[PDB]
Design a protein around this ligand. Structure first.
Ligand SMILES: NCCCCCC(=O)N[C@H]1Cc2ccccc2[C@@H]1Cc1ccc2c(c1C(=O)O)OCO2
Ligand SMILES: NCCCCCC(=O)N[C@H]1Cc2ccccc2[C@@H]1Cc1ccc2c(c1C(=O)O)OCO2
Lengths: 149, 149
């Protein structure tokens, strides 16, 4: 559970926002990309796994699950690549909800930034610091720290 | 101490590698950029502060310390922007040493990747996971977790 992440892809302004969610905490990382390709997804996963202890990734769709470039990155980074089938149906709702929340924050900050990528990183910041009371950022650190001990 | 980061800029293949070091743990994040500008530095800091609780940043040079775009990002993200003068002279040696280590890892992986940015993220991965015994990744989580409690 401390090492399980979920990929999520959403769209805004004719562009693609790729998101990784740490399932146990709700903590996220995200990037703007021109289009979701195996190559973009592979590079993003490499970045994530160098920064947090990523054991398992639930991929966001069958194309990324199939992609040989994505498999190569998961192999390289020691990641178990799994499908993202919501056997638990609440998953879909949680993801949907998070996408709406992120787009809302992006809209709230959009005019403070000339470029979309900046607004998206502002949204990552606000989401991870938001007190719900602990924040997502505090929960991920606590979960992993307990696990290390 | 749990919130103190140091910026570091090094060069390779006619390009610039921008690095942020968590001082207490040795944990890093890094990116390849065409040139070190206020704009690139500001965007990088925003990304970092959305991902880890960045309280203080020791900037890597006077230009980034002076840059209004960098000051705007530090303001936005709640970061105390400080100079990076090594009042403790061991700092210079630690930074120099880390840059050599990173370039060595990059050389060891360089042929596994078509692009430099990929090799640099491979190096971030290897550096943060390297058991020295705890890893840098384990130390940063433990330091911040203790602080939260
Ligand atoms: N000898 C030259 C042959 C190089 C290709 C070999 C090969 O498949 N490497 C994988 C291994 C590996 C492992 C993890 C992540 C990326 C990669 C690389 C692929 C790759 C994918 C996406 C990218 C890339 C590159 C890149 O190749 O940099 O660049 C920016 O987005
Ligand atoms: N639309 C009217 C607003 C005009 C921008 C106002 C303004 O200075 N915002 C700062 C606030 C702020 C706060 C933190 C980080 C960036 C920024 C932004 C600057 C900026 C810097 C670097 C970048 C950027 C942009 C960007 O502007 O996206 O994009 C990629 O690297």
């Amino acid at each position: 559970s401390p090492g399980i992440w979920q990929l999520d892809c959403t769209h805004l302004e004719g562009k693609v926002i790729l998101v990784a969610v740490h399932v146990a905490s709700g903590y996220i990382e995200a990037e703007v990309i021109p289009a979701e390709t195996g190559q973009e997804t592979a590079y993003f996963l490499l970045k994530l796994a160098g920064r947090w202890p990523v054991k398992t990734v639930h991929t966001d769709n069958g194309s990324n699950f199939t992609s040989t470039t994505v498999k190569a990155a998961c192999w390289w980074a020691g990641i178990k690549q799994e499908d993202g089938i919501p056997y638990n149906p609440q998953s879909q709702g949680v993801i949907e909800s998070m996408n709406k929340e992120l787009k809302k924050i992006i809209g709230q900050v959009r005019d403070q930034a000339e470029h979309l990528k900046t607004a998206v990183q502002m949204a990552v910041f606000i989401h991870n610091h938001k007190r719900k009371g602990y924040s997502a950022g505090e929960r991920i650190v606590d979960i992993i720290a307990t696990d290390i001990q």
